[PDB]
Each structure stands twice: as C-alpha cells, then as structure tokens.
User: Which sequence fits this backbone?
C-alpha cells in the first residue's frame, strides 16, 4: 500500500518548450522572456504498467532551475485526468523538495492498457536562474525518466535605470502580487529621494508587515530575475517610515531618511492584494522623485478574461 | 422604467490596444496577428450621473469590423462590476446587432458619485475584416461616446499553400472548434486528392451534419480571415463521401470524387468537440495526399492552465 511505482510508469516524448518564446534580434535564438508573458510548457506521453494499483505513488522531480507554475506559483494540488474528465492521480507539490508526489486512484485497478499524456505550465526557478541572457538547464525526472533542455532566460533588468520593478511572484492562494523594486542600481547620489507606490485594483495591508527594505551591500545582490535571496541581504526596514494613504493604495517613503544625501542602493519588496475575487487585473505604479526629476516604472496586469470596477459614495 | 440613459453614462480615456501585438519587420507597424494569439483590449473610464436609476439601460454598440470576445465568440452575458466584486449592470450581447444592452441594478440608486472602468477582450469581426495586412477601423460607441482606431490585421493566409487551415471560431457555450480549411488556393490539377483530418482531444459528431464542403467559384471567396461568407458559396457537401473512423477522431474524403482529375478549389468547414470539460486543449491535424506527395497543416490549442488525458480498456 503506497508502493512507489516510478519504475512502472514510463514516459516518452518528453519536451520542454517556450510558449511562445521571443526571438533575440541579434543572436537569432528563441528565448524565454519571463517578464513578457512567456511560460515553459512541459509535455510527455506515458503508459502505466497493468500491475500498478490503487494508492501506488510516483513522482515528478524538478531540477535546480525549473519548476511547475508561471509567474503565479504552482498549486500544492497537481492532478492528472483521463479522457472522461475524471481525476486518475492526485498529486501534492512540495516547493521545498521541488517534487510532486502523485497517488493513483482506483482507475488503475478498473482499467488495463492505460496510456496518457500531459502538458504542464512551468517556469524558471527564479531564485536560481538569476541572470539575463544566460542559458539554464531545465531538468525534470518523470518517474525514472530524465529529460533536460537548455533555455535562455531574459527578465529585462536594465541596470542603468535608477528605478525598475518586476513581479517576483503571484501567490497562488490569494493572487497577491509580490513585488521586487530596485532602487539606484547605477549608484548615483541623491539629495531628494521620495519613493511612492500607487496601486490600482489592489491594496497594501500594513498590519501584515510585508513591506520590506533591504540595503544592498554588494552589486551582485541585484539579481536580474527580481528574486533576490533575502537571506544574504541587510534588512533595514525598521529604520524607515513607510506612510500609507489613499485607502491603502499609496505608500510613500523618504529614502534619504534624515540624511542630507544618499548613495545607498535598495531592494524593496511589497505585497499587494486584489480588491476582490472577480478579477486580479490592475496596475502598480512606482515613482522616484529626486533632485534631477521623477523616474517611473509600472507593472500592469491584464488577463484574457476582461474585468471591470467602480466605486461610489453610499447615500 | 427601462429609461435609456446613454446620455447619462459618460465615458472617457477610451482606448483599443493590440495585446500583445506583433511588429511587421518590413513596415515597422504593430499589427494584430489574430491567428498568433493576439487579441484586442477595449478600455474606458466612466461616470454615472446621479439621476440614473435602477432599471435604466445603456448600450455599447460595436462597429462593422470590431466585436467583443476573442477567437472564442463572446458570451451573451456581459456584466459590469464594482470594486466589491458585485454586479452593478447586467448586460445582454446580441450578435445580430453587435450591441450590448446593459441594465443598472439598484446600485445606482443606493450610491452617488459613481465612477468606474472596464477592460474587455475584443477581436475583429472576421466576416468583415477579411484581408491580411489591411487596416480596419475598429469603432465603438459607449453610451453616446464614440471612438475609433485603425488596426492592421493579419491572419497568415499563405495563398501558395495547397492546404491551409485556421480556427474560424470557438463556440462560447460548448467550446467546439469551428474550423475553416482552404484546399487548392493556387489552382493546381490533382489526380489523387485524399483529405484527412485527425483530432487529438476532440471528436466529430457525424450526426450533427456540420462537416460542409463548398466549391469555390471565385478566388475572392477565399478570405484571409478564414471566415468566408457561406451564403456566397456553392454547397457540394452531399456529393462527397466523408468517412469517419478512429472513434470519430478521423475523417477522410476523396476530393476527386469519382473523377480522374480535379482542379476544383474548396472551402471545408468542420466542428470538433472537446472530449471533456476539464480542458479544451488538443490539436487538429490536416493532410492532403496528392500525386505529388503529402501536404499538412495543423492547429494546436494550448491554454495557460495545463491539462492531461488518458485512455484504457475497462476491465
Ligand atoms: Mg493496474
Ligand atoms: Mg442614481
């Protein structure tokens, strides 16, 4: 009962593809533009040996640079279906081990000569696949069958920009946007440095204590993937006053923080929660006001479903 | 009751954008590649005059070349929401008049100073926006506020191909693929002409009488949009023998049809139904076997969700 049957579930035609992929003007390669709506697609065929029984298990093990999901983190639930639309294997995905463990239903005792296929949306493990225009080996083991493919990733980090942001990830359970903002990558000096975030369709939760400010101590902390390793970083959150306003849709912080000038470099992380469950569409707008003027970077969320919103004053 | 309040619902910042759009390498323009996953996005802000009351109506009227929806036809249901996630206007889209009529709830009596916005996925009206690399004026009237934007469409009709297919539309209610296949656009002569369709993840319904063969009598009838006008066409369906096999996943037709040779040109339409409701992913493969060898064209469906299937022999 619970027997591991990795050796009895046989995968063929394993493939990782970039969907849709962006062709690099100069090199001619198709790349994975992770911040331009590309995803990875993992596909395979499989057969199940007849001796497999109800409750037998098998695993999908994903590698260092590869995981299921998209910008949105994968569900803990991962199921496989039959052509009738019924679940035949119930899977639990563990992020810590980057592994899904599937358990067969009674389908495998009710049916013989089973063959199937799947297609799964997949992505870079951003905390490891860190750097723009760099090939990373995307690896997976389905049962005991291994496959790998090199994928060139680009996240578009423009290291000359004084303000640049990206979605780090979307939470699968609450659809919150988990943001990463890079301030001062090019190491200028400022004598005014007001950082404002304005949310459309989202709100901050100040009580959740998830607006975090890290002082960079090494340029290589700014990973191109916008998924820095917050355990390497200097947390200075408590030194700053983050002021909320506009129904928790605006956050303002004086990054000078009582100094007359600063050449400090920052990684800022934030969590923005959709207004309601009818949509997660919206926009997050960043501005940085310095002595030289204002820089801006925005992040828009517009799905293929459409949406609408409205507000008014109750009488 | 039921007062038309088009004059009392005011739209601003109306926009139609191509999402994502494709840049034409030669011309430099951003184009709507309708068969390469682009859609249109209609956006606007609005305000509601306070005198509007429950049951008051307003329209969105779409133009000759523009409609809501995507490759998938729009729902008859079109709602507007507030930031709490509640419906504030219940809409009915009529394809015949290309108009949505919205009815306000009691939100517009219980609230004052209402403003809002929407974002709607939209598309070409393919029966009218027929031709590749052609600008079509995409027009809409929201209330009494009109807007238009020229959009260059491309469907990728390669007129030199002896066989080419496209999705005409996806049915919104049953997710069927409604396909258009062009045979012999360049008008060659054949002495073998076997046309086969193979479905993966879909089945034909032979009983439904929706596999149609039209004999082209004017090159113009091949519209690049793959949405020909079947009223201008010569229906020859009943002359041909369409042979179903492989669990209604394969259809085979001898297009020579008892002649020794043929230079006829054909438009073929078909309807392919998903195996189940858990997904509509899958593929349709077409081949044409002539004296010269075999031509093939395929259409794949791979959503951002993932899917899986399987089949076996019930014990
Ligand atoms: Mg068995
Ligand atoms: Mg009113």
Assistant:
């Amino acid at each position: 009962q619970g027997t591991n049957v990795n050796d009895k579930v046989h995968f063929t035609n394993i493939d990782i593809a970039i969907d849709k992929g962006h062709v690099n003007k100069t090199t001619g390669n198709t790349e994975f533009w992770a911040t331009s709506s590309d995803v990875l697609k993992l596909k395979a065929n499989y057969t199940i040996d007849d001796s497999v029984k109800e409750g037998d298990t098998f695993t999908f093990k994903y590698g260092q640079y590869f995981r299921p999901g998209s910008v949105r983190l994968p569900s803990q639930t991962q199921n496989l279906y039959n052509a009738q639309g019924n679940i035949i294997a119930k899977g639990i995905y563990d992020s810590k081990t980057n592994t899904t463990t599937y358990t067969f239903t009674n389908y495998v005792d009710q049916y013989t000569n089973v063959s199937g296929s799947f297609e799964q949306v997949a992505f870079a493990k951003r905390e490891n696949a860190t750097t723009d225009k760099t090939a990373y080996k995307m690896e997976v083991t389905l049962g005991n069958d291994t496959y790998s493919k090199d994928v060139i990733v680009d996240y578009g980090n423009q290291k000359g920009q004084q303000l640049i942001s990206s979605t780090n990830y979307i939470n699968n359970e609450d659809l919150s946007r988990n943001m990463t903002v890079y301030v001062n990558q090019h190491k200028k000096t400022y004598t005014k440095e007001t950082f404002v975030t304005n949310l459309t369709g989202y709100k901050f939760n100040p009580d959740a204590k998830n607006f975090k400010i890290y002082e960079v101590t090494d340029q290589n902390q700014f990973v191109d993937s916008f998924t820095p390793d917050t355990s390497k970083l200097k947390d200075v959150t408590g030194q700053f006053d983050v002021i909320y306003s506009n129904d928790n849709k605006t956050a303002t912080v004086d990054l000078l923080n009582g100094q007359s000038s600063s050449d400090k470099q920052y990684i800022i992380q934030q969590v923005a929660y959709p207004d309601n469950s009818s949509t997660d569409n919206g926009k997050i707008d960043y501005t940085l006001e310095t002595q030289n003027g204002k820089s801006s970077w925005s992040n828009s969320y517009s799905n293929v479903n459409g949406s609408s919103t409205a507000n008014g004053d109750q009488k």
